[PDB]
Amino acid sequence: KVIDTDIHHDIASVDDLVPYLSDHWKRYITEYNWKPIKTTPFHQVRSGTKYRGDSFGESKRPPGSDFELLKKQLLDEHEITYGVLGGWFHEATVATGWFEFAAARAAAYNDYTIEQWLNKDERLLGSITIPADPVAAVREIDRVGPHPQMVQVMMSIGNFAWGDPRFHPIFEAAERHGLAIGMHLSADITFQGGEFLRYYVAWRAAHPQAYMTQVISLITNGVFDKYPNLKVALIEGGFEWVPFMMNRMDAAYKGLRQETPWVKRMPSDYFRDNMRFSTQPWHDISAKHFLDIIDMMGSDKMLMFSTDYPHWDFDAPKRTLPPKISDDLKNKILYENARELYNL
Amino acid sequence: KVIDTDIHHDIASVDDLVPYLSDHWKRYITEYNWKPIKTTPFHQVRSGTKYRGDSFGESKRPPGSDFELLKKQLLDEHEITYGVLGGWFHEATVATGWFEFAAARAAAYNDYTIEQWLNKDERLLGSITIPADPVAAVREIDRVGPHPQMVQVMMSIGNFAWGDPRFHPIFEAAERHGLAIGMHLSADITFQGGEFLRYYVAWRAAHPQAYMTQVISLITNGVFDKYPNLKVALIEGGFEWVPFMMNRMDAAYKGLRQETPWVKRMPSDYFRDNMRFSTQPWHDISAKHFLDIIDMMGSDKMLMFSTDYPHWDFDAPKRTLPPKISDDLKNKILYENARELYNL
Ligand SMILES: [Fe+3]
Ligand SMILES: [Fe+3]
Ligand SMILES: [Fe+3]
Ligand SMILES: [Fe+3]
């Protein structure tokens, strides 16, 4: 009855990666003291920062890194049929130097998911962590993509556009392996002139813009005309802006499609046929206003559920959707739209 | 019946500025052959580019640089009661160097608008062109803001955020003079990583994001708590995304408001009380979807109309709103909302 499309399991220590790195790269952790950097100059102004208070546990363990707490607190407690692990490994994809090392960690992150998460539970599905280098990412996708519980290539949203023709081999590898594209913000997003907007509360209100840029980038570069069977899940960008983007791009393309002649359809088509959007973070939306938005969308196949466990704005699956919506809709958003996406 | 809030008068050539510049800066046009730069690597793939086919006339004159044609084709032809001239002078405001000269051009642009446009027709109103530097921007507002037909300070949208405390002296100087803030895109907006997104059709699709950052920046830096009678006109960024941003910022703020303790109201109160949005460019929208957007806004006082004369996606007043809406809403969008905004 419910498929969770955004779960952030984690490593509890950078040392969890040493057992999967070649001996060259083991040194960067053991001897050269490599730690992952995040560039966001701010965070949630609350105790427990980005997490639920009850996700840390008693062993001082980073939330999301304890498999057993994941099982109890989320999979069992909230009756999850299938959870799509997102990871907390975006750092390797949005890395700004040491790209060779970054590719090594990508493979290392995926070994850790397969061996310490996917293989320990049938309800867990995985996303492939990739470096941004298209050659290495195709090489990683070919490596762990054949895995049966691997459903998604994770294109972490950074300060570049995935739909650029340089990354087109990565989409082809994912279609050649029956995978969807997941897309989730990273913490490094900046905006015009590269500024962070001074406050986390402002940065948080802005970052759906980066999601919007990626859908424009996928559509205008003809990614969906080249691979019309590829689907892309936008995870945690919201969805209330979606009818606006559909209308704007349709109107833009009615006058000017000759600039990108490889785009054969109307942009709102690729929204219905090739893209899914998570409902998290859910905000109090009346059932009248929610149904308006579905109607402005022209489909009920486009929304999916996610909890974002273990993050502070966690959404519980029986407490989020407006109660007055049809059970048919309720089941499509809670289960069917995702199940179709992941061939589940 | 109609107040047009986006009209783009222009100079015919950089020699129109020379009478209004000091001798020092005359030389930059006379001897050093200065020409404004725009950085956009693309434009509309169409004959006439960004302009209407009938806007050039037969003089080879730049569209919108011809007072008499603007009168016949726009003010008279479409029966405009008041036009808010927005100019095409954002280059001075979004200048990236030679700032001292940029201030001088700002004044010369305003001198041009006053002497050759505002003082030649009573249905015309003006925006104040400013340099970005807040000291000299205040100097210019003080100098030309007392002109009886100047209703707006033009805060041209580039690759920075106007809500920054750096700029608050400009906000204050507008309110002290009884002027609103206009906010219109530049040619020079980029996005994540400072990229342009390869095709003008993509760039068109994305530049509403920059409007989104401006309204976030205004709220979170407390511009409207500092000046609660100050109103801002987002002109040509669209409006169908207004509901999503009001709810996104309201959800953020319920939980994180102590980060910005100067923000005393709810974000969506500022949207209703402090912000006004243009309808251009108008995309077909059903009557019910349009009314659902207004219900979602919680106010019928936020939408205004503009033609965007002389650009290629010009809207005509008798033919843009949903033909099924009440005369009460039609008059509020076409006239009343702007008339309250500009104390007209
Ligand atoms: Fe997430
Ligand atoms: Fe989150
Ligand atoms: Fe305009
Ligand atoms: Fe325009």
XYZ file of C-alpha atoms and ligand atoms in Angstrom:
692
model
C 0.000 0.000 0.000
C 2.929 2.536 0.310
C 6.234 3.033 -1.540
C 8.673 5.529 0.028
C 10.698 7.353 -2.658
C 13.056 9.336 -0.384
C 14.996 7.657 2.445
C 18.398 8.951 3.595
C 20.435 6.142 4.958
C 23.993 7.126 5.687
C 27.434 6.005 6.759
C 28.140 6.388 10.491
C 31.851 7.082 9.775
C 33.989 7.937 6.697
C 35.788 4.743 7.858
C 32.773 2.762 6.628
C 34.244 3.423 3.168
C 37.794 2.146 3.796
C 36.726 -1.542 3.391
C 35.473 -0.790 -0.161
C 38.221 1.514 -1.477
C 41.258 0.245 -3.356
C 44.412 0.576 -1.267
C 45.490 3.717 -3.120
C 42.285 5.441 -1.982
C 42.169 3.895 1.492
C 45.099 6.160 2.369
C 43.153 9.377 1.704
C 40.963 8.477 4.689
C 43.381 6.615 6.947
C 46.472 8.782 6.362
C 45.473 12.006 4.572
C 42.380 12.585 6.751
C 39.876 13.198 3.986
C 36.452 14.348 5.197
C 33.501 15.361 2.988
C 32.860 19.083 2.770
C 29.526 20.827 2.440
C 29.540 24.457 1.382
C 26.239 25.582 2.791
C 27.100 28.344 5.223
C 23.969 27.730 7.316
C 21.463 25.088 8.537
C 18.186 24.558 10.431
C 18.079 26.847 13.473
C 16.888 24.149 15.905
C 18.232 21.365 18.112
C 18.737 18.174 16.099
C 19.494 20.351 13.005
C 18.064 18.650 9.866
C 16.814 15.496 11.683
C 13.923 14.222 13.795
C 14.812 14.280 17.485
C 14.229 10.507 17.783
C 16.574 9.437 14.938
C 19.920 9.608 16.680
C 19.465 6.665 19.005
C 21.573 5.884 22.055
C 24.924 4.963 20.457
C 25.781 8.513 19.334
C 25.091 7.191 15.840
C 24.471 9.491 12.830
C 20.755 9.298 11.981
C 20.076 7.016 9.056
C 23.294 5.028 9.518
C 21.755 2.400 11.862
C 19.961 -0.295 9.853
C 17.985 -1.559 12.824
C 16.656 1.880 13.732
C 15.608 2.305 10.090
C 13.691 -1.003 10.202
C 11.906 -0.217 13.479
C 11.298 3.533 13.199
C 10.287 3.558 9.523
C 9.951 0.320 7.571
C 8.000 -1.555 10.281
C 6.394 1.309 12.199
C 5.005 3.086 9.122
C 4.190 -0.141 7.215
C 6.384 0.656 4.201
C 5.943 -1.759 1.304
C 9.126 -0.590 -0.455
C 11.638 2.114 0.401
C 13.921 3.751 -2.174
C 17.132 4.667 -0.399
C 18.482 8.028 -1.506
C 21.734 7.966 0.416
C 23.521 10.950 1.862
C 26.357 10.707 -0.606
C 25.632 13.632 -2.928
C 29.084 15.029 -1.989
C 30.772 12.667 -4.433
C 28.590 13.817 -7.327
C 28.849 17.553 -6.674
C 32.571 17.410 -5.845
C 34.629 20.394 -7.005
C 38.081 18.768 -7.185
C 39.723 15.401 -6.691
C 37.327 13.866 -9.178
C 39.384 10.651 -9.415
C 38.948 10.062 -5.676
C 35.299 11.132 -6.009
C 34.640 8.381 -8.535
C 36.258 5.890 -6.141
C 33.905 6.936 -3.366
C 30.900 6.592 -5.687
C 31.653 2.892 -6.196
C 32.486 2.633 -2.495
C 29.128 4.179 -1.511
C 27.236 1.715 -3.746
C 29.105 -1.323 -2.363
C 28.114 -0.182 1.139
C 24.471 0.136 0.099
C 24.403 -3.270 -1.562
C 26.208 -5.143 1.195
C 25.013 -3.376 4.338
C 21.498 -2.242 3.355
C 19.990 -3.821 0.224
C 21.178 -7.357 1.003
C 19.783 -7.172 4.566
C 16.147 -6.468 3.608
C 13.855 -7.165 0.678
C 11.827 -3.952 1.139
C 14.900 -1.803 0.416
C 15.627 -0.516 -3.075
C 18.705 1.443 -4.033
C 20.008 4.399 -6.038
C 23.386 4.331 -7.797
C 25.772 7.019 -6.580
C 27.675 8.370 -9.587
C 30.502 10.850 -10.064
C 29.653 13.648 -12.430
C 32.313 12.541 -14.985
C 30.139 10.924 -17.682
C 32.781 8.273 -18.490
C 33.201 7.137 -14.886
C 29.439 7.345 -14.171
C 28.559 5.077 -17.085
C 31.301 2.779 -15.759
C 29.755 2.763 -12.298
C 26.206 2.354 -13.626
C 27.297 -0.657 -15.694
C 28.892 -2.129 -12.549
C 26.083 -2.055 -9.964
C 23.056 -1.396 -12.197
C 22.422 -5.100 -12.941
C 21.696 -5.547 -9.249
C 17.996 -6.481 -8.846
C 17.221 -4.042 -5.977
C 18.892 -1.101 -7.799
C 16.143 1.001 -9.430
C 17.618 4.496 -9.829
C 20.635 6.478 -10.917
C 20.954 9.392 -8.464
C 21.733 12.639 -10.311
C 22.404 14.838 -7.279
C 21.291 18.390 -8.056
C 24.312 20.650 -8.097
C 25.280 23.880 -9.796
C 25.068 22.407 -13.291
C 22.375 21.042 -15.594
C 22.213 17.294 -16.083
C 20.360 17.616 -19.396
C 23.444 19.122 -21.040
C 24.540 16.914 -23.997
C 27.755 16.077 -22.062
C 25.804 13.847 -19.651
C 23.756 12.094 -22.310
C 25.754 8.802 -22.056
C 24.617 8.574 -18.438
C 20.926 8.675 -19.394
C 21.556 6.042 -22.060
C 23.293 3.729 -19.590
C 20.295 4.129 -17.257
C 17.804 3.343 -19.993
C 20.044 0.536 -21.271
C 19.762 -0.889 -17.722
C 16.036 -0.306 -17.113
C 16.678 2.345 -14.435
C 14.892 5.582 -13.649
C 16.691 8.841 -12.908
C 16.268 10.143 -9.406
C 17.071 13.781 -8.736
C 17.553 15.183 -5.235
C 19.052 18.501 -4.074
C 22.496 18.580 -2.612
C 23.482 21.099 -0.020
C 25.701 23.030 -2.360
C 23.001 24.734 -4.429
C 23.555 28.440 -5.062
C 21.549 30.945 -7.059
C 22.105 34.004 -9.269
C 25.683 35.211 -8.962
C 26.399 32.143 -6.802
C 25.087 33.601 -3.586
C 23.528 31.540 -0.796
C 20.852 34.139 0.148
C 22.170 34.759 3.693
C 19.706 32.575 5.676
C 18.792 28.900 5.585
C 15.132 29.799 5.554
C 15.715 31.762 2.309
C 17.970 29.101 0.755
C 15.295 26.510 1.538
C 12.602 28.636 -0.129
C 14.839 29.050 -3.180
C 16.153 25.623 -3.923
C 13.080 24.360 -5.912
C 14.484 26.714 -8.581
C 17.325 24.241 -9.156
C 14.729 21.484 -9.673
C 12.940 23.721 -12.171
C 16.221 24.301 -14.060
C 16.736 20.540 -14.399
C 13.318 19.904 -15.972
C 13.959 22.750 -18.426
C 17.384 21.271 -19.105
C 16.101 17.720 -19.686
C 13.336 18.929 -21.999
C 15.195 21.494 -24.128
C 18.167 19.215 -24.703
C 15.901 16.479 -26.072
C 16.815 13.870 -23.441
C 13.234 12.557 -23.558
C 13.108 12.509 -27.367
C 16.319 10.436 -27.482
C 15.130 8.071 -24.724
C 11.359 8.402 -24.622
C 11.037 5.549 -22.160
C 13.226 7.187 -19.535
C 11.499 8.582 -16.468
C 12.986 11.095 -14.035
C 11.859 11.434 -10.439
C 12.221 14.870 -8.898
C 12.609 14.200 -5.198
C 11.974 16.963 -2.631
C 11.607 19.837 -5.052
C 7.897 20.157 -4.278
C 5.196 20.038 -6.950
C 2.974 23.080 -6.528
C 5.120 24.913 -9.098
C 4.668 22.165 -11.672
C 1.595 23.540 -13.533
C 3.355 26.900 -13.794
C 6.433 25.336 -15.466
C 4.248 23.253 -17.799
C 2.342 26.351 -18.930
C 5.406 28.561 -19.283
C 7.371 26.062 -21.375
C 4.376 25.254 -23.588
C 3.921 28.948 -24.367
C 7.657 29.432 -24.908
C 7.737 26.525 -27.363
C 4.660 27.511 -29.354
C 6.644 30.427 -30.782
C 10.210 29.233 -30.832
C 10.506 25.436 -31.228
C 12.785 25.819 -34.295
C 15.638 26.661 -31.917
C 15.587 23.081 -30.558
C 14.048 21.083 -33.412
C 14.880 17.745 -31.780
C 12.091 18.344 -29.237
C 9.080 16.799 -30.962
C 6.352 17.080 -28.319
C 4.797 19.775 -26.196
C 6.773 20.346 -22.969
C 3.723 19.536 -20.787
C 3.792 16.109 -22.460
C 7.202 15.251 -21.071
C 5.920 16.323 -17.639
C 3.058 13.811 -17.764
C 4.858 11.057 -19.636
C 8.452 11.272 -18.333
C 8.575 12.908 -14.866
C 7.399 12.131 -11.337
C 7.448 14.480 -8.352
C 7.513 13.771 -4.647
C 4.894 15.243 -2.277
C 7.461 15.922 0.496
C 7.725 18.334 2.149
C 3.958 18.361 2.512
C 2.477 21.719 3.473
C -1.125 22.191 4.703
C -2.989 22.159 1.361
C -6.783 22.073 1.380
C -8.309 19.183 -0.531
C -9.986 21.767 -2.756
C -6.608 23.342 -3.601
C -4.823 19.976 -3.985
C -7.437 18.764 -6.484
C -7.158 22.023 -8.410
C -3.414 21.378 -8.692
C -3.913 17.818 -9.945
C -6.364 19.226 -12.458
C -3.852 21.886 -13.581
C -1.438 19.001 -13.973
C -3.653 17.106 -16.460
C -2.754 13.750 -14.868
C -2.967 11.842 -11.601
C 0.057 9.710 -12.584
C 2.665 12.325 -11.632
C 2.769 12.548 -7.826
C 4.526 10.099 -5.511
C 4.864 9.739 -1.793
C 8.002 10.052 0.275
C 8.767 10.457 3.959
C 12.289 11.920 3.790
C 13.194 9.788 6.773
C 15.051 10.730 8.890
C 14.789 14.474 8.183
C 13.023 17.032 10.373
C 10.203 17.664 7.890
C 9.504 13.898 7.772
C 5.998 13.199 6.400
C 4.041 10.346 7.868
C 2.241 8.307 5.151
C -1.187 8.210 6.889
C -1.062 11.822 8.123
C -0.080 13.819 4.990
C -2.555 13.520 2.106
C -5.833 15.465 2.462
C -8.453 13.098 3.904
C -11.233 14.089 1.496
C -9.511 12.789 -1.639
C -10.761 9.659 -3.373
C -9.215 6.372 -2.297
C -8.302 5.894 -5.976
C -6.087 8.985 -5.933
C -4.790 8.141 -2.441
C -3.563 4.776 -3.703
C -2.010 6.218 -6.853
C 0.097 8.708 -4.925
C 0.890 6.335 -2.071
C 1.807 3.341 -4.231
C 0.807 3.013 -7.865
C 2.637 5.939 -9.458
C 5.924 4.866 -7.833
C 5.301 1.170 -8.495
C 4.906 1.876 -12.204
C 8.056 4.058 -12.151
C 10.259 1.350 -10.669
C 8.698 -1.634 -12.506
C 7.652 -2.889 -9.073
C -10.180 50.985 -18.037
C -6.501 50.192 -18.682
C -3.242 50.932 -16.871
C -0.280 49.348 -18.668
C 2.506 48.545 -16.227
C 5.244 47.464 -18.687
C 6.090 49.658 -21.689
C 9.629 49.734 -23.094
C 10.488 53.099 -24.545
C 14.073 53.335 -25.715
C 16.795 55.623 -26.964
C 17.345 55.630 -30.726
C 21.122 55.342 -30.248
C 23.715 56.147 -27.628
C 23.902 59.694 -29.040
C 20.613 60.499 -27.314
C 22.518 60.374 -24.032
C 25.204 62.930 -24.968
C 23.117 66.112 -24.300
C 22.413 64.855 -20.757
C 25.994 63.867 -19.780
C 28.763 66.005 -18.346
C 31.673 66.769 -20.648
C 33.758 64.080 -18.919
C 31.284 61.324 -19.758
C 30.266 62.725 -23.156
C 33.763 61.680 -24.289
C 33.065 58.029 -23.430
C 30.448 58.074 -26.171
C 32.082 60.680 -28.390
C 35.729 59.527 -28.425
C 36.074 56.184 -26.622
C 33.163 54.689 -28.667
C 31.152 53.268 -25.781
C 28.287 50.944 -26.618
C 26.158 49.133 -24.000
C 26.864 45.443 -23.617
C 24.467 42.602 -22.997
C 25.861 39.116 -22.275
C 22.935 36.862 -23.296
C 24.456 34.368 -25.781
C 21.126 33.928 -27.621
C 17.773 35.527 -28.469
C 14.469 34.814 -30.266
C 15.140 32.719 -33.424
C 12.762 34.876 -35.470
C 12.835 37.889 -37.797
C 12.161 40.915 -35.555
C 13.649 38.968 -32.639
C 12.103 40.319 -29.404
C 9.840 42.880 -31.104
C 6.430 43.001 -32.821
C 6.614 43.006 -36.637
C 4.885 46.414 -36.850
C 7.120 48.195 -34.281
C 10.091 49.310 -36.423
C 8.242 51.608 -38.798
C 10.038 52.799 -41.915
C 12.854 54.942 -40.463
C 14.975 51.975 -39.358
C 14.269 53.440 -35.922
C 14.632 51.160 -32.884
C 11.162 50.017 -31.792
C 9.920 52.033 -28.878
C 12.324 54.915 -29.501
C 9.661 56.774 -31.508
C 7.285 58.728 -29.284
C 4.733 59.291 -32.067
C 4.511 55.643 -32.968
C 4.136 54.579 -29.351
C 1.284 57.045 -29.018
C -0.521 55.872 -32.128
C 0.173 52.127 -31.857
C -0.107 51.687 -28.079
C -1.599 54.571 -26.073
C -4.177 55.643 -28.672
C -4.668 52.322 -30.501
C -5.415 50.314 -27.331
C -6.948 53.193 -25.347
C -4.420 53.149 -22.520
C -5.369 55.366 -19.597
C -1.890 55.253 -17.994
C 1.382 53.710 -19.148
C 4.281 53.064 -16.775
C 7.367 53.472 -18.964
C 9.915 50.826 -17.984
C 12.574 51.789 -20.494
C 15.268 49.542 -21.876
C 18.050 50.848 -19.680
C 18.774 47.945 -17.314
C 22.374 47.958 -18.602
C 23.321 50.778 -16.247
C 21.879 48.981 -13.220
C 23.369 45.557 -13.929
C 26.724 46.972 -15.072
C 29.682 44.831 -14.020
C 32.351 47.531 -14.162
C 32.845 51.209 -14.930
C 30.366 52.018 -12.174
C 31.027 55.779 -11.955
C 30.071 56.068 -15.624
C 27.065 53.800 -14.989
C 25.702 56.273 -12.414
C 26.066 59.090 -14.966
C 24.136 57.119 -17.571
C 21.371 56.402 -15.066
C 20.807 60.126 -14.609
C 21.045 60.716 -18.372
C 18.483 57.987 -19.015
C 16.084 59.613 -16.515
C 16.744 63.056 -18.068
C 15.852 61.490 -21.408
C 12.631 59.966 -20.136
C 11.560 63.131 -18.387
C 12.345 65.567 -21.177
C 11.317 63.522 -24.226
C 8.598 61.200 -22.919
C 6.909 62.104 -19.632
C 6.764 65.797 -20.506
C 5.125 65.033 -23.864
C 2.058 62.981 -22.836
C -0.075 62.969 -19.691
C -0.994 59.331 -19.906
C 2.643 58.469 -19.307
C 4.430 57.600 -16.127
C 8.082 56.837 -15.529
C 10.459 54.564 -13.695
C 13.720 55.812 -12.259
C 16.842 54.172 -13.677
C 19.499 53.716 -10.978
C 23.062 52.477 -10.615
C 23.410 49.504 -8.294
C 25.611 51.449 -5.866
C 23.207 52.452 -3.055
C 24.801 55.877 -2.322
C 24.447 57.139 -5.919
C 21.092 55.379 -6.334
C 19.770 57.462 -3.420
C 21.297 60.570 -5.007
C 19.431 59.863 -8.247
C 16.108 59.091 -6.559
C 16.373 62.356 -4.628
C 17.105 64.232 -7.839
C 14.342 62.887 -10.134
C 11.899 61.217 -7.724
C 10.088 64.501 -7.111
C 9.072 64.517 -10.765
C 5.250 64.333 -10.588
C 4.972 61.531 -13.147
C 7.662 59.247 -11.692
C 5.931 56.509 -9.727
C 8.524 53.754 -9.538
C 12.181 53.030 -8.768
C 13.376 50.423 -11.309
C 15.366 47.752 -9.452
C 16.520 45.861 -12.570
C 16.924 42.108 -11.834
C 20.444 40.839 -12.406
C 22.716 38.355 -10.636
C 22.349 39.735 -7.149
C 19.528 40.017 -4.574
C 18.028 43.446 -3.913
C 16.759 42.522 -0.449
C 20.342 42.560 0.804
C 20.762 45.071 3.667
C 23.360 46.673 1.411
C 20.468 48.050 -0.657
C 18.042 49.105 2.092
C 18.960 52.816 1.697
C 17.393 52.617 -1.799
C 14.205 51.046 -0.422
C 13.974 53.762 2.245
C 14.552 56.527 -0.282
C 11.721 55.231 -2.449
C 9.321 55.150 0.469
C 10.400 58.586 1.690
C 9.588 59.927 -1.808
C 6.268 58.058 -2.202
C 7.679 55.750 -4.913
C 7.076 52.031 -5.424
C 9.673 49.473 -6.511
C 9.529 48.034 -10.012
C 11.496 44.836 -10.704
C 12.098 43.717 -14.305
C 14.426 41.083 -15.764
C 17.743 42.021 -17.384
C 19.230 40.376 -20.390
C 22.051 39.251 -18.075
C 20.405 36.783 -15.630
C 22.115 33.393 -15.258
C 21.326 30.402 -12.993
C 23.170 27.641 -11.082
C 26.836 27.637 -11.942
C 26.229 30.905 -13.742
C 25.155 29.108 -16.872
C 22.708 30.381 -19.494
C 21.200 26.950 -20.358
C 22.295 26.711 -24.036
C 19.111 27.964 -25.734
C 17.144 31.170 -25.334
C 14.045 28.990 -25.125
C 15.435 27.404 -21.950
C 16.573 30.788 -20.605
C 13.086 32.202 -21.158
C 11.678 29.241 -19.256
C 13.994 29.820 -16.293
C 14.169 33.513 -15.602
C 11.041 33.519 -13.369
C 13.394 31.859 -10.832
C 15.214 35.170 -10.450
C 11.926 36.867 -9.594
C 11.479 34.117 -7.021
C 14.773 34.925 -5.374
C 13.984 38.609 -5.260
C 10.731 38.108 -3.326
C 12.445 35.641 -0.959
C 15.211 38.153 -0.425
C 12.802 41.014 0.204
C 10.790 39.125 2.808
C 13.664 37.444 4.708
C 15.779 40.542 4.985
C 12.712 42.274 6.434
C 12.341 44.975 3.798
C 8.586 45.202 4.392
C 8.852 45.107 8.193
C 11.208 48.099 7.829
C 8.924 49.878 5.311
C 5.395 48.416 5.593
C 3.818 50.879 3.118
C 6.439 50.032 0.461
C 5.049 48.016 -2.456
C 6.972 46.021 -5.098
C 5.876 45.233 -8.686
C 7.277 42.052 -10.126
C 6.849 42.825 -13.796
C 7.109 39.993 -16.356
C 8.105 37.162 -14.093
C 4.646 35.603 -14.357
C 2.288 34.928 -11.453
C 1.152 31.253 -11.639
C 3.999 30.392 -9.230
C 2.955 32.960 -6.625
C 0.714 30.462 -4.744
C 3.551 27.854 -4.489
C 6.034 30.406 -3.095
C 3.549 31.792 -0.529
C 2.878 28.269 0.824
C 6.548 27.207 0.650
C 7.664 30.294 2.567
C 4.786 29.951 5.057
C 5.718 26.329 5.795
C 9.368 27.247 6.190
C 8.565 30.090 8.536
C 6.263 28.311 11.005
C 9.323 26.282 12.035
C 12.420 28.431 11.396
C 11.400 32.055 12.031
C 13.902 32.691 14.874
C 16.649 32.711 12.235
C 15.148 35.955 10.850
C 13.427 37.455 13.924
C 12.797 40.816 12.185
C 10.154 39.210 9.943
C 7.063 39.904 12.049
C 4.302 38.772 9.670
C 3.604 35.643 7.639
C 5.373 35.587 4.235
C 2.020 35.369 2.476
C 0.883 38.545 4.283
C 3.676 40.397 2.475
C 2.628 38.872 -0.842
C -0.913 40.200 -0.356
C -0.053 43.559 1.179
C 3.311 44.465 -0.335
C 3.701 42.712 -3.691
C 1.935 43.164 -7.055
C 2.487 40.988 -10.131
C 2.094 41.603 -13.842
C 0.043 39.221 -16.007
C 2.308 39.514 -19.093
C 3.212 37.176 -20.657
C -0.273 35.749 -20.777
C -0.694 32.145 -21.570
C -4.069 30.695 -22.209
C -5.620 29.742 -18.950
C -9.071 28.398 -18.294
C -11.486 30.603 -16.384
C -11.633 28.121 -13.526
C -7.852 27.650 -13.306
C -7.373 31.420 -13.250
C -9.974 31.787 -10.493
C -8.356 28.880 -8.651
C -5.003 30.749 -8.721
C -6.688 33.894 -7.242
C -8.482 31.855 -4.548
C -5.128 30.307 -3.773
C -3.676 33.771 -3.344
C -6.238 34.906 -0.817
C -6.561 38.328 -2.442
C -7.883 39.848 -5.651
C -5.592 42.830 -5.202
C -2.263 41.364 -6.332
C -2.570 41.019 -10.155
C -2.044 43.872 -12.646
C -1.897 44.079 -16.414
C 0.749 45.071 -18.899
C 1.166 44.852 -22.654
C 4.971 44.643 -22.803
C 4.906 46.956 -25.805
C 6.823 46.655 -28.086
C 7.965 43.108 -27.466
C 7.056 40.091 -29.560
C 4.755 38.581 -26.871
C 2.704 41.763 -26.521
C -0.663 41.294 -24.772
C -3.672 43.304 -25.896
C -6.028 44.452 -23.101
C -9.259 43.548 -24.871
C -7.914 40.048 -25.489
C -5.852 38.604 -22.665
C -7.931 37.859 -19.566
C -10.246 34.777 -19.466
C -13.392 36.056 -21.205
C -15.571 34.512 -18.510
C -14.434 36.541 -15.523
C -16.492 39.173 -13.737
C -16.298 42.809 -14.779
C -15.275 43.429 -11.136
C -12.141 41.285 -11.426
C -11.489 42.441 -15.009
C -11.473 46.049 -13.816
C -9.300 45.222 -10.813
C -6.616 43.577 -12.921
C -6.757 45.976 -15.836
C -6.906 49.114 -13.705
C -7.721 49.245 -10.033
C -4.840 47.234 -8.632
C -2.276 49.326 -10.499
C -4.111 52.567 -9.692
C -3.864 51.827 -5.951
C -0.231 50.783 -6.390
C 0.779 54.081 -7.999
C -1.672 56.394 -6.089
C -3.131 57.301 -9.420
Fe 15.382 13.797 0.695
Fe 15.346 16.979 3.596
Fe 8.971 43.824 -20.401
Fe 9.488 41.396 -22.694
